[model samples]
Target: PLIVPYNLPLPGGVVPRMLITILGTVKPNANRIALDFQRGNDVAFHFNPRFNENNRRVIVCNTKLDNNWGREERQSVFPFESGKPFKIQVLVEPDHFKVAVNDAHLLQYNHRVKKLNEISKLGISGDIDLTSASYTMI
Candidate 1:
């Protein structure tokens, strides 16, 4: 079991034409799961998928700079479920990140942090069993 609250350093950092992939399973009682691209104490990209949020399934995408969160972008598409596995891909583009879930396009989040290459860490936490997390330059 690749436990929760896992973090790994990205040597090359997040740059254009890079593909980041995550394989994991949502716990049977999963309430929420978070994946973050970080730069020191700042979070460049915050991807959070929540289950049973006011009796609705939703996903929130945002950024945190200087310990303050920006406006949250919410999506009603819930491609994840309790007790199921998923494959997520985040493709780095010049201006935004292209996200895909289970081989289909999910959503794109525009870069709030202009210098993508400064994002040096990947963080995963909450209610999911991580199988593998990796990146490839393309």
Candidate 2:
């Protein structure tokens, strides 16, 4: 997998009940994979799944505004496997973001920014292929 951030191109702003799906193959040694929802220079959400060198894994969720990151929330139960293909889904609701990996519920984060429409771009990195990414709106 490769790390490429700030490339999630959300042509249409994320509105109510919108969902985004990403597909890719993992790297043998994935250090971290992240998806950042951006509003100009501001990031409404930052989702990171990391595979540490010490055999520890974690998922981090946070937001950025004015170039400063918010308090990070982490999850220890990682659902990703090395050197495998996987799908990630991020659903937007009124108050929070629901994330799932391989059809399994991963975690949710409360909204930090005011308007979802302000999130105009997406950034991604860590063990993924941006060229073949597939997304849908409903």
Candidate 3:
């Protein structure tokens, strides 16, 4: 479980990238975890490397894990702007990444690499403002 506060505006619905490093015990073989967030109304989450040429957006959800980045679908939430900070939860299992933003939105991302047991490192960078972040394994 990671709690992150993002206080930035995403101009024109443009997708952004993030580089995040997990501090908890996300061993390379852990399975199933939850991610929570608290922020405004207009906010969403997406996996890094949306596309190769930075043209297409890659949204990862609880779908089948695949290396074909081009075949990945870009997922997002309806336009929303929250005045107060909200919470977004993510479940990082051995084979998938399930995310819930502001407690109402939900999305999933499959493991791209073959070694599902080797996902101890997390890189989060995107069109959102991360002021505070916290994570826990259940």
The TM-score values for the models, in the order shown, are 0.97, 0.89, 0.43
lDDT tens digits by residue: candidate 2, 1-138 = 334653767776677677888888777877888888898888898989888836789888898889999899989979887787888889887888899999999999898887888887878777755445545667
Task: Find the candidate with the highest lDDT and give its number.
Answer: 1
Give the top-scoring candidate (TM-score).
Answer: 1
| Residue 137's lDDT in candidate 1 | 89
TM-score of 3: 0.43
Clashing residue pair totals per candidate (backbone < 3 A) = 0, 8, 40
Q: Candidate 3 regions off by >4 Å? A: 1-68, 79-84
Which stretches of model 1 miss by more than 4 angstroms?
Answer: none
lDDT of 1 by residue, 64-134 (tens): 99999999999898899899999999999999989999998899999999877789998999899899998
Kindly indicate the candidate among 1 and 3 with the higher lDDT.
Answer: 1
Pairwise TM-score winner, candidates 1 and 3: 1
Candidate 3: C-alpha lDDT: 0.35
Q: Rate the local accuracy (lDDT) of all candidates.
A: 0.91, 0.81, 0.35
lDDT string for model 3 (64-130, tens) is 2231223445554521232224455556554555655555545565544433333333333443334
**Pairs in clash, predicted candidate 1:** none
